[PDB]
C-alpha cells in the first residue's frame, strides 16, 4: 500500500484516448505503470490503434455501443462541452471541490484557466492540459545556405520569396541536383500561416482555426477578403514549389525528412525541438546551421508572430456518464496536479529518464544527447501526453540549446507575438447555434483552403460560391453570437 493510493481496493479503468492523428493510451507505458502503482488504478486503453484520425476516433467511439470510462486527447474542448452537456460526460465541480486539493488549489489561483475550461451550464466537463512556457513557434532558416549563397537574411516578404527561390534554383546543398525544397512544416495548417505574410491572419490563437478580435469585433481568418488576397499568394508560392509540394501529406517527420535530408530550407516550428536539429545532423551535414529569424516585415509593414502557448490548451480529458467509480478517478486526476505526479507526467520515470539531483529532476544524459527531441521521448514512454496535466517549463529548459534560447529572448524582447485570443462565455442558447454549425463550418473552411492552395480552385473566382456557402452552412449564424457573447464581457 502506498499513502498515495486514491482507493484501498485495485482498480482498472478502461480509457479511449486517440491524440495526434498516431498515439493511443498504453497501459505498459512506464509512465502508466508508475502512476497506477502509486495510485491503486490501472487504465486500460481501447482506442483503434489503426486509425490517423483522431477526431474520427472519438466520433467512431461515441457511435460504437457504451463509452469507456475515460476519454482523453487533444482538442476535444467542443466535444467534451458539447456531449457534457448532453449528459455523456459528468460535471466535475462538486467531485473537485470535496475530493480534489491539487485542482481545487489550482483553480483559486488560476481563475483564467478554469473560466477558459467551463461550459455555458456553469459545469467543468475536463480537466485540461496545461502548458507552460510563452512563446511557442518562430521562422527558421538555414544560415549556412544563405552563406554559401551569399545573401542576406531577409528582412521583408519580397526578400523572403528572393531567398526561397535561391534556395530552389541555386542548388544550396551542391549536389548538382533541383532537390531543395525551401519550406517545410510538421503542420499542414502553417502553410496556412503564410498569409501573414500578406497581411492576413489565420488564427485568433495556438487553436487551429480560431477566432480573433480587432477593433472589438469578433473575426475569423478564413473569412476574411483578407484571407482571399492572402490565399492567392500562398498559392503562387506553392506553384512556384516555394512551398513543399507534399506539405498537407508529409507532417509529423518532416524535419528528419528534409533536414535530415538536407534539402529543407526553412520552416516555422517550436523553438527547443526545431533548434535541437542542429545538433542532431552535426554529424552528417557539418555546417548545418538552423537559425531562428525574425519574422519578415510584412504588407501591413509589420512583423508578425502570430503563434504563442495557449494556457490552457483545447485538450484533456473527462470522466464519462458510465463511469461507476468518479470519485475514485476524480482522486486519481487530482495526483496529477500533486508534486509527485506532476514530476512524472512532465519528466517520465525516475531512474529511467530522469534522476532527482539537489532535490531537482534532471534528465540523464541519454536522454538529452538523443537524436530524437525530448518530447518525442517522452511521448513514448507516456509523459508529456494530452490528458489533464500540469506542464512544467523545466522539463523543456533542459533541452533547449544556446540556438533555441536566443531566438525564444529575441521573439520576447522585440515583442512580435500578436495579442491572443481568450475566447468568450457563450449562453446556452448561444452555444446551441455553436455545436449545430461550427464544426462543419470549420471542416469545410480547411478544404477550401487546401484546394486554393493546391490550386484545384481559383480563390477569386471561387469566392462568392465559397460566402454563399458559408452562410448557407450557418457560419454567420455563428458569428453572430460570439459576437454578442463578446459584448458581454466587455
Ligand atoms: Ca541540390
Request: proline share 6%.
Amino acid at each position: 500500500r502506498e499513502a498515495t493510493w486514491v482507493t484501498e481496493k485495485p482498480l482498472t479503468l478502461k480509457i479511449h484516448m486517440h491524440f495526434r492523428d498516431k498515439w493511443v493510451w498504453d497501459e505498459n507505458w512506464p509512465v502508466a505503470r508508475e502512476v497506477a502503482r502509486l495510485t491503486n488504478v490501472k487504465l486500460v486503453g481501447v482506442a483503434n490503434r489503426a486509425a490517423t484520425n483522431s477526431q474520427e476516433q472519438f466520433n467512431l467511439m461515441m457511435a460504437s455501443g457504451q463509452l469507456p470510462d475515460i476519454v482523453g486527447g487533444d482538442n476535444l474542448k467542443d466535444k467534451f462541452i458539447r456531449y457534457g452537456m448532453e449528459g455523456a460526460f459528468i460535471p466535475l465541480n462538486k467531485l473537485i471541490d470535496q475530493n480534489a486539493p491539487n485542482l481545487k488549489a489550482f483553480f483559486k489561483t488560476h481563475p483564467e484557466v478554469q473560466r477558459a475550461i467551463t461550459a455555458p451550464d456553469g459545469n467543468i466537463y475536463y480537466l485540461p492540459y496545461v502548458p507552460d512556457g510563452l512563446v511557442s513557434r518562430g521562422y527558421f532558416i538555414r544560415q549556412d545556405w544563405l552563406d554559401k549563397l551569399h545573401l542576406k537574411t531577409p528582412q521583408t516578404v519580397d526578400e523572403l520569396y528572393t531567398v526561397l527561390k535561391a534556395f530552389k534554383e541555386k542548388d544550396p546543398n551542391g549536389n548538382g541536383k533541383a532537390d531543395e525544397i525551401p519550406f517545410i512544416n510538421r503542420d499542414p495548417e502553417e502553410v496556412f500561416r503564410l498569409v501573414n505574410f500578406w497581411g492576413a491572419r489565420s488564427t485568433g490563437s495556438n487553436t487551429w482555426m480560431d477566432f480573433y478580435v480587432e477593433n472589438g469585433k469578433i473575426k475569423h481568418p478564413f473569412a476574411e477578403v483578407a484571407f482571399k488576397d492572402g490565399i492567392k499568394h500562398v498559392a503562387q508560392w506553392y506553384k512556384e514549389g516555394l512551398i513543399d509540394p507534399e506539405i498537407f501529406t508529409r507532417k509529423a517527420r518532416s524535419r528528419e525528412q528534409t533536414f535530415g535530408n538536407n534539402i529543407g530550407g526553412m520552416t516555422h516550428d517550436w523553438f527547443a525541438s526545431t533548434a535541437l536539429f542542429n545538433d542532431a545532423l552535426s554529424k552528417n551535414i557539418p555546417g548545418f546551421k538552423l537559425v531562428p529569424m525574425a519574422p519578415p516585415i510584412n504588407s501591413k509593414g509589420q512583423r508578425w508572430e502570430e503563434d504563442a502557448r495557449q494556457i490552457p490548451r483545447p485538450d484533456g480529458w473527462a470522466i464519462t456518464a458510465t463511469n461507476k467509480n468518479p470519485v475514485e478517478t476524480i482522486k486519481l486526476f487530482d495526483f496529477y496536479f500533486g508534486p509527485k505526479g506532476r514530476e512524472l507526467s512532465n519528466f517520465g520515470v525516475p531512474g529511467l529518464t530522469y534522476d532527482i539531483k539537489n532535490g531537482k529532476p534532471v534528465y540523464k544524459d541519454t536522454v538529452l544527447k538523443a537524436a530524437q527531441p525530448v518530447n518525442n521521448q517522452m511521448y513514448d514512454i507516456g509523459a508529456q501526453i494530452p490528458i489533464g496535466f500540469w506542464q512544467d517549463y523545466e522539463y523543456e529548459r533542459q533541452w533547449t540549446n544556446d540556438v533555441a534560447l536566443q531566438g525564444i529572448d529575441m521573439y520576447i524582447k522585440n515583442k512580435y507575438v500578436l495579442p491572443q485570443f481568450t475566447g468568450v462565455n457563450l449562453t446556452v442558447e448561444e452555444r446551441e447555434i455553436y455545436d449545430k454549425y461550427w464544426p462543419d463550418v470549420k471542416t469545410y473552411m480547411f478544404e477550401m483552403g487546401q484546394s486554393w492552395v493546391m490550386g484545384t480552385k481559383d480563390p477569386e473566382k471561387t469566392w462568392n460560391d465559397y460566402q454563399q456557402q458559408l452562410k448557407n452552412r450557418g457560419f454567420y449564424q455563428v458569428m453572430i453570437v460570439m459576437q454578442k457573447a463578446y459584448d458581454r464581457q466587455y
